[PDB]
Structure 1
Amino acid sequence: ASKLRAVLEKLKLSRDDISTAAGMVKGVVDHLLLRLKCDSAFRGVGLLNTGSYYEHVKISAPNEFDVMFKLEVPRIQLEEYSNTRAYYFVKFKRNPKENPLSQFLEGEILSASKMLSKFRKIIKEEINDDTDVIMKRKPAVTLLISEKISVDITLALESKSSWPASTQEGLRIQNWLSAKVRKQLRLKPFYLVPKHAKEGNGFQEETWRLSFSHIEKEILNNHGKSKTCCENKEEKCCRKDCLKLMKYLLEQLKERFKDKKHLDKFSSYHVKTAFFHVCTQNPQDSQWDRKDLGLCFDNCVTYFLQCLRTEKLENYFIPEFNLFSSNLIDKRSKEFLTKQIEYERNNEFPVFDE
């Protein structure tokens, strides 16, 4: 744990870079926020608060930022595509009056691809008009600011409805954060992003993915069984430090296997998800004591290793959606990273050496 305390101390040394870059991202996003609102389709648009350290700007990696644009979409009806559990067609209840988004209708359903293609069109126009920002390739739109800072921009529909039934069994925080907290969180809105399902070797370009990204800050910064966890000197846990270490381990591993880019498909979303599953299995604050940093880290890596070997990682909100399914990440990649992480844990993480 001496080695892990050192790693965490070094990471603090790059707060300024992160914080000034974030501010750079914050400017651009506010620019874009103005233009979208001129559009009859996007005037109910606004920034969704999804960050644990910065309000509108979540950090997905050392020079990678994630920002979400919510759009209030009333009277929304869902029909689940096949049995994906996470992907849905979007309809409306009736025609109360003909809504603004009607331009992206195809029959009764709302076209993920059409709405996305106008979102992307508006953002690129403003991108030309002083910081040097461009667009990148490929659920998201992507910017490159000053050639060093990457920003992912995700349009989300905001539904204030009851969560779909696939989430009935997710958010298994009861023995940890209590059943009351799960009830309060399940009363917040949920979000639908235009991530297209993978069918055949193409995509179904009218499906929307459910998104609970905004719940992370709600739990990350209110993370203990005790309501006052980490609010006083007598209640320090290492929950946040293990999450940082988990992310950093994957960042470092992806940087070294960059030659053949084997770890292309893994991201801190997987890491977060396995982390919170471990919080579910270890619900007591006494299980995350700060002097146990080493053993708590090994818990998290072990569980991550289990997911990789069994090729199974449940969406934290949708237990029947397998983030490590073969439809998403091929078998060679999962096999590969099992081997790398097996090694790292069996040899005391030499990837953290100096």
Structure 2
Amino acid sequence: GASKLRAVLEKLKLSRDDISTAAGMVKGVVDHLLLRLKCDSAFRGVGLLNTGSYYEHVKISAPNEFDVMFKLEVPRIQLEEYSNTRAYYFVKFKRNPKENPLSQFLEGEILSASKMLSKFRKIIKEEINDIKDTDVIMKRKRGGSPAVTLLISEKISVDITLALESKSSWPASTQEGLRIQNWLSAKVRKQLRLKPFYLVPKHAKEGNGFQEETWRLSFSHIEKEILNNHGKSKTCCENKEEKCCRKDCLKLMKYLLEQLKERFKDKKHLDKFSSYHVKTAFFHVCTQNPQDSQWDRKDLGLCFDNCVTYFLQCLRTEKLENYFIPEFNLFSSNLIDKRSKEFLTKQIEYERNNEFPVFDEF
């Protein structure tokens, strides 16, 4: 019916106009840090990957939560796959034309993420002390995950991820991924694979067996491009007659998971599940439902139910392929325990049967 769902979207947007003030505060700090990082020998070519102000909001429940990614271009990269995981690689250099300033970040022959991150945190920490025009402090240490957490005016938090940039062709593991031919045409897919790919140092809970010095592929820039150009029609959501509910279904699905995680934060068995699992499942639904008529504004309740049931199927069958790397199973028994998915399945099933009481009125 979406009468309830519409009411949900209306309160989430009222908080995003309040964000614009804090968004400018993020940009000011980010621009300042980039200025210093460029003055460093190793971080000479750093910069923002995508739109700096108002970057990713992993939490939509928390407007104060901010996510930022820094790109560092390194040419002539030799990627060695780690144990056929297909999502994690070792970074090596080729031929050594001459020693690079990045040689201070490598152990043995592989490029160490720990060394690069350590100096990265030190340079940032040095700067926020020299900033008294804007009250900022650094959080420590969040388990060791690459994200550096800063806090502006004691209310908003900003996570800064350092990523490597490669303008070479996408790895072989992404060959059969990004299947958007029926949805966004083979031309667009081909254009997207011409874009550079990115490497991100491993998570806090990696989890083993990981050598601790491997890097994970990142295509968040492609995901954003798809989100802003989601329609089968080139004018989708550019006029009143083509206002689909794709983005809304993604928000509701992300907000559902967050509300569930907040509800069971004492057990910490929904913490493995992140907004990226939801985001991954959503892209698959878009692939299975490429027509814009399958995402009509009037069928918001019906469209959201499809996203829910598909996510349920992914839990039961324990299959959730990475949208770019097919052989990478996000819901594999090695990444998340089976009891966790069954727990999440039961909770979601309860929400579907009782018209999602966790959403509203609140």
Both proteins in one fold, TM over 0.5:
yes
Helix, strand or coil at the partner of 2:240:
coil
Deviation at 1:51, TM superposition (A): 7.2
Structure 2 distance, partners of 1:196, 1:66, is 15
Deviation at 1:246, TM superposition (A): 1.0
Q: Which runs of 5+ in 2 are unaligned?
A: none
Structure 1 distance, partners of 2:211, 2:205, is 7
Structure 2 distance, partners of 1:63, 1:324, is 29
Q: Deviations over 1:32-63 (max 9, x none)?
A: 11111111000100011067965999979533
Q: Which runs of 5+ in 1 are unaligned?
A: none
Deviation at 1:199, TM superposition (A): 7.6
- Whether the aligned pair in 1 keeps the contact of 2:111 and 2:213 (CA below 8 Å) is yes
TM-score w.r.t. length of structure 1: 0.93
Question: Measured at CA, do residues 134 and 332 of structure 1 come closer, stay the same or move farther in structure 2, by a change above 3 Å?
Answer: farther
Of stretches 121-130 and 37-46 in structure 1, the one that deviates more from structure 2 is 121-130
- Whether the aligned pair in 1 keeps the contact of 2:207 and 2:335 (CA below 8 Å) is no
Question: Measured at CA, do residues 92 and 318 of structure 1 come closer, stay the same or move farther in structure 2, by a change above 3 Å?
Answer: same
Question: Measured at CA, do residues 52 and 164 of structure 1 come closer, stay the same or move farther in structure 2, by a change above 3 Å?
Answer: farther
Question: Measured at CA, do residues 279 and 49 of structure 1 come closer, stay the same or move farther in structure 2, by a change above 3 Å?
Answer: same
What is the identity percentage for the equivalent residue pairs of Structure 1 and Structure 2?
Answer: 100
- Whether the aligned pair in 2 keeps the contact of 1:52 and 1:217 (CA below 8 Å) is no
Equivalenced residue count is: 354
Structure 1 distance, partners of 2:97, 2:39, is 24
Question: How large is the Cα RMSD of the aligned pairs?
Answer: 2.3
Structure 1 distance, partners of 2:25, 2:102, is 31
Q: Are 1:131 and 2:134 an aligned pair?
A: yes
Helix, strand or coil at the partner of 2:316:
helix
Question: Measured at CA, do residues 29 and 93 of structure 1 come closer, stay the same or move farther in structure 2, by a change above 3 Å?
Answer: same
Question: Measured at CA, do residues 299 and 55 of structure 1 come closer, stay the same or move farther in structure 2, by a change above 3 Å?
Answer: closer
- Whether the aligned pair in 2 keeps the contact of 1:163 and 1:190 (CA below 8 Å) is yes
Question: Measured at CA, do residues 58 and 333 of structure 1 come closer, stay the same or move farther in structure 2, by a change above 3 Å?
Answer: closer
Of stretches 242-251 and 279-288 in structure 1, the one that deviates more from structure 2 is 242-251
- Whether the aligned pair in 1 keeps the contact of 2:55 and 2:66 (CA below 8 Å) is no
- Whether the aligned pair in 2 keeps the contact of 1:68 and 1:154 (CA below 8 Å) is yes
TM-score w.r.t. length of structure 2: 0.91
- Whether the aligned pair in 2 keeps the contact of 1:87 and 1:208 (CA below 8 Å) is yes
Of stretches 45-54 and 81-90 in structure 1, the one that deviates more from structure 2 is 45-54
Question: Measured at CA, do residues 219 and 175 of structure 1 come closer, stay the same or move farther in structure 2, by a change above 3 Å?
Answer: same
Q: Deviations over 1:49-86 (max 9, x none)?
A: 06796599997953321111101101111010111101
Structure 1 distance, partners of 2:207, 2:267, is 26
Of stretches 44-53 and 273-282 in structure 1, the one that deviates more from structure 2 is 44-53
Deviation at 1:90, TM superposition (A): 0.8
Deviation at 1:155, TM superposition (A): 0.8
Deviation at 1:17, TM superposition (A): 2.5
Deviation at 1:214, TM superposition (A): 1.0
Q: Deviations over 1:310-347 (max 9, x none)?
A: 22221111111122223333333222211111110111
Question: Measured at CA, do residues 77 and 269 of structure 1 come closer, stay the same or move farther in structure 2, by a change above 3 Å?
Answer: same
What's the counterpart of residue 228 of structure 1? 235
Structure 1 distance, partners of 2:272, 2:181, is 31
Question: Measured at CA, do residues 53 and 105 of structure 1 come closer, stay the same or move farther in structure 2, by a change above 3 Å?
Answer: closer
Deviation at 1:266, TM superposition (A): 2.0
Structure 1 distance, partners of 2:169, 2:67, is 26
Structure 2 distance, partners of 1:208, 1:184, is 25
Question: Measured at CA, do residues 254 and 290 of structure 1 come closer, stay the same or move farther in structure 2, by a change above 3 Å?
Answer: same
Q: Are 1:159 and 2:166 an aligned pair?
A: yes
Deviation at 1:212, TM superposition (A): 0.4
Structure 1 distance, partners of 2:243, 2:40, is 48
Helix, strand or coil at the partner of 1:46:
strand
- Whether the aligned pair in 2 keeps the contact of 1:57 and 1:65 (CA below 8 Å) is yes
Question: Measured at CA, do residues 326 and 81 of structure 1 come closer, stay the same or move farther in structure 2, by a change above 3 Å?
Answer: same
- Whether the aligned pair in 2 keeps the contact of 1:194 and 1:208 (CA below 8 Å) is yes
Structure 1 distance, partners of 2:342, 2:147, is 28
Structure 1 distance, partners of 2:18, 2:202, is 31
What's the counterpart of residue 103 of structure 1? 104
Question: Measured at CA, do residues 202 and 136 of structure 1 come closer, stay the same or move farther in structure 2, by a change above 3 Å?
Answer: farther
- Whether the aligned pair in 2 keeps the contact of 1:242 and 1:297 (CA below 8 Å) is yes
